[PDB]
Amino acid sequence: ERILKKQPAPVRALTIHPLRRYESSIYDTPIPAYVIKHSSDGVTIDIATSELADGQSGSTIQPFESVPAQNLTLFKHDFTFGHLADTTDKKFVEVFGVLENRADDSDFQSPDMIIETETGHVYVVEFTTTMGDANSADLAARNKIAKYEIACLDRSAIKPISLYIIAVHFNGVVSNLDLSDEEVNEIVFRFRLARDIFEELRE
Ligand SMILES: [Mn+3]
């Protein structure tokens, strides 16, 4: 019997912490070799994680990956963020139910994460990437906020919601989470490696 579920109600409202610019501080760090091979559905990838130093950016990377042909278009986004959450089609409706009598489009939106805690807060987290610079990243982040703000606002009447964004570019992250340098480095490092792999995969 979980006692945190027995607290007085929290304020039902949408919270958005301000976005911040972070920059990677990677420098000369080995980038693992990868071997791409044709497979039955798509490609197999073999990442030489042995080449990485202990305590260096990239320690979250797994040596082996299967990418089916239907998943190559999402590979960059999903690989980049694969240490924080696995791919999902978990919709708003699974967590809040339909909002007024009738189901609508915002019920079937699927942000990258929807976390609900015992205390009754809900956290919506969305990841994204850009091939441009930090300004591109800031803009990408604002577009994800615009994509999901309405659905979050209406449902915050049911449980309070905090909306978070992580937007990666080649040299940093725009995010309203409070990230360490290692955490920024890991995201960027995984993004840079995903870019290299993706250019050979589209080919
Ligand atoms: Mn995303």
Residue numbers in the entry: 2 to 204
Publication passage describing the model:
Crystals of the apo form grew as small bars in the presence of 2 mM MnCl2 that diffracted to 2.4 Å. In the apo crystal asymmetric unit, each molecule incorporates one Mn2+ ion (Mn1) in the active site with real space correlation coefficients (RSCC) of 1. The Mn2+ ions are octahedrally coordinated by the sidechains of D113 on βa, H78 on αb, E127 on βb and the main chain carboxyl of F128 on βb, together with two water molecules, all at distances of 2.2 Å. D90, residing in the flexible loop between αb and αc, is displaced from the manganese coordination site and shows high B-factors (above 94 Å2) compared to the low B-factors (<40 Å2) shown by the other highly ordered catalytic residues. The electron density for the entire flexible loop and in particular for D90 is weak but unambiguous for the main chain. K145 is located in helix αd, and forms one hydrogen bond to the water molecule that coordinates the manganese ion. The apo structure also contains seven sulphate ions bound to molA and three to molB in the asu with RSCC above 0.83. Four sulphate ions are found close to the active site. Finally, a fourth sulphate ion (SO4′), outside of the proposed RNA binding path, forms a hydrogen bond with K145 amino moiety.
Here, we carried out a structural and functional characterization of the TOSV cap-snatching endonuclease, an N terminal domain of the viral polymerase (L protein) that provides capped 3′OH primers for transcription. We report TOSV endonuclease crystal structures in the apo form, in complex with a di-ketoacid inhibitor (DPBA) and in an intermediate state of inhibitor release, showing details on substrate binding and active site dynamics.
